[PDB]
Amino acid sequence: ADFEVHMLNKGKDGAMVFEPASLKVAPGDTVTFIPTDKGHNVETIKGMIPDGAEAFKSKINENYKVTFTAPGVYGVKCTPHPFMVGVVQVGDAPANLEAVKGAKNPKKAQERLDAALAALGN
Numbered sequence: 639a640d641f642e643v644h645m646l647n648k649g650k651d652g653a654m655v656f657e658p659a660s661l662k663v664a665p666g667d668t669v670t671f672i673p674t675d676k677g678h679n680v681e682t683i684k685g686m687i688p689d690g691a692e693a694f695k696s697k698i699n700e701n702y703k704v705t706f707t708a709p710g711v712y713g714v715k716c717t718p719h720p721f722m723v724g725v726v727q728v729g730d731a732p733a734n735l736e737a738v739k740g741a742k743n744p745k746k747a748q749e750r751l752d753a754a755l756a757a758l759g760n
């Protein structure tokens with residue numbers, strides 16, 4: 639299955655958001671990150687992807703597709719926008735949950751990640 643995440647200046651969560659900011663997918667599913675507004679990108683957060691996964695980074699304004707196969711959670715962020723974060727989950731019982739949940743980001747970033755994990759049933 640293929641899924642889309644839009645990069646937006648504003649959403650229910652406030653300014654600078656991935657929408658949806660949380661997505662549960664099956665191994666082999668894909669997510670394309672699509673800038674609805676200019677000035678955004680996507681990249682994985684250091685330490686926040688599974689063993690077996692590769693990091694990634696898009697260019698500002700680039701439409702960017704990633705295939706997810708390694709099971710676990712994947713924290714992603716937008717470079718210019720500190721609170722702009724999201725979580726892609728592959729499978730159930732992710733094994734690297736604490737990598738995201740136990741991290742020490744600025745509060746508004748960390749609460750958005752934490753909300754994303756809780757919405758994914760964790």
Ligand SMILES: [Cl-]
Nearest residue numbers: 699700701702
């Ligand atoms: Cl593009």
Ligand SMILES: [Cu+2]
Nearest residue numbers: 678716719722
């Ligand atoms: Cu952004």
